[PDB]
Antibody
């Protein structure tokens, strides 16, 4: 089986160097080109460049050239994507992929037939930081009420949110986090419940931020006058 | 640079239905160099078709491709639940190799208007110098929804961010959060906070509001 195994998730500061790897198996590494593809969070695919392992002369997309380097070490079946100085704009998922083409020396390429699992790169001025958890308190309003928790200013991803220690699952929505201009993430977790349950049923959001070993249990109540 | 334009941006279909996706090249792309990929959330893309019409290894026969001039088509003859994903086209004829912007195939269902909710910033957060005002659009369909923030009837711009959930596994709806971020000083300078929601399922736009310091 042909496999492309990429290195683990990276969390870096602007100006730091970084080399991510793609180790291949199941075929002759020098008989196929390798491509690198960038995918920004919630965005489409962008071709970065290609390398023919061995005759290490890399071809770049002009918009990527100069800021990133593509190289390969045929002795260890590994392709690399490398930056000397990261920018917050380098935050994205990176994929390596095997290129397929003709068998007659035309130099034609058809596409990327086998892809690596991807490597997430997060570039931010922030250091590890646990979230502040604020209530999204239900209004004095078919008889459905909404309540939630605002999980603010944490780094890096991820946070998990459960409600009433996992007993409350129906109607729960935990939104994807947004990376704020400060370099810290923010997300909200909400639940719709019967309005008649407000003040009779306890609602607690259980937030866990494993990177900072932060566990917060926030009781969410209607705001008193 | 060869620009590939995919159409439509989103296809809303039911399992069992036919899906027809288009990819138009800015200049002539010879059929051998046009490929299609499928990408699922949290997964790498997968090669579906190469050379405009040839199925990649292990790809089922419900997937096919065809060309007509600068227009390339990917057809899914009968959608299976695993086919609701994002599809990209790519050309490898000219450097730089380029991708289309993608077409999302989502699950079709009846129109559902959002339930709208507004949340003021907590007293706890205000102690920090920042105020976050949250507007929730709950369980709606289709995806298209417009959220506009008003502070003392002044239309807001550039100070809000939206996040959307993936289509719900049980009811095929979307949910959306919009967060308005203000300094504590600006928050305390104004009284009326409102979010106005426009959606296909709402006969009139729905406005949810609160007055700062009222219950």
């Amino acid at each position: 089986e042909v496999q492309l195994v990429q290195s683990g998730a990276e969390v870096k500061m602007p100006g730091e160097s970084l080399r991510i790897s793609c180790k291949v198996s199941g075929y002759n590494f020098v008989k196929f080109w390798i491509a690198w593809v960038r995918q920004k969070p919630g965005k489409g695919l962008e071709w970065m460049g290609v390398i023919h392992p061995g005759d290490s002369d890399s071809t770049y997309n002009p918009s990527f050239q100069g800021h990133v380097s593509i190289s390969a070490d045929k002795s260890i079946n590994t392709a690399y994507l490398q930056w000397n100085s990261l920018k917050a704009s380098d935050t994205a998922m990176y994929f390596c992929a095997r290129v397929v083409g003709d068998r007659e020396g035309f130099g034609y390429h058809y596409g990327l037939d086998v892809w690596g699992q991807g490597t997430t790169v997060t570039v931010s001025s922030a250091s590890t930081k646990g979230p502040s958890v604020f209530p999204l308190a239900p209004s004095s309003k078919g008889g459905t009420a909404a309540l939630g928790c605002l999980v603010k200013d944490y780094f890096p991803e991820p946070v998990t949110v459960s409600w009433n220690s996992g007993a409350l699952t129906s109607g729960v929505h935990t939104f994807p986090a947004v990376l704020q201009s400060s370099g810290l993430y923010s997300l909200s977790s909400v639940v719709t419940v019967p309005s008649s349950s407000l003040g009779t049923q306890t609602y607690i959001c259980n937030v866990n931020h494993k990177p900072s070993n932060t566990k917060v249990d926030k009781r969410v109540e209607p705001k008193s006058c | 640079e060869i620009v590939l334009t995919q159409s439509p941006g989103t296809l809303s279909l039911s399992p069992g239905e036919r899906a027809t996706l288009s990819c138009r090249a800015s200049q002539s792309v010879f059929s051998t160099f046009l490929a299609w990929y499928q990408q699922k959330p949290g997964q790498a893309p997968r090669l579906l078709i190469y050379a405009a019409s040839r199925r990649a290894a292990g790809i089922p026969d419900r997937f096919s491709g065809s060309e007509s001039g600068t227009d390339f088509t990917l057809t899914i003859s009968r959608l299976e639940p695993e086919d609701f994903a994002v599809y990209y086209c790519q050309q490898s004829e000219s450097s730089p190799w380029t991708f289309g912007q993608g077409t999302k195939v989502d699950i079709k269902r009846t129109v559902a208007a959002p339930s709208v909710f507004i949340f003021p910033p907590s007293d706890e957060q205000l102690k920090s110098g920042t105020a976050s005002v949250v507007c929730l659009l709950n369980n709606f369909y289709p995806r298209e929804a417009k959220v506009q923030w008003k502070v003392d009837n002044a239309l807001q711009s550039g100070n809000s961010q939206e996040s959307v959930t993936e289509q719900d596994s049980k009811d095929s709806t979307y949910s959306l959060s919009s967060t308005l971020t203000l300094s504590k000083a600006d928050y305390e300078k104004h009284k009326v906070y409102a979010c106005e929601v426009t959606h296909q399922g709402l006969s009139s736009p729905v406005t949810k509001s609160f007055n700062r310091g009222e219950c």
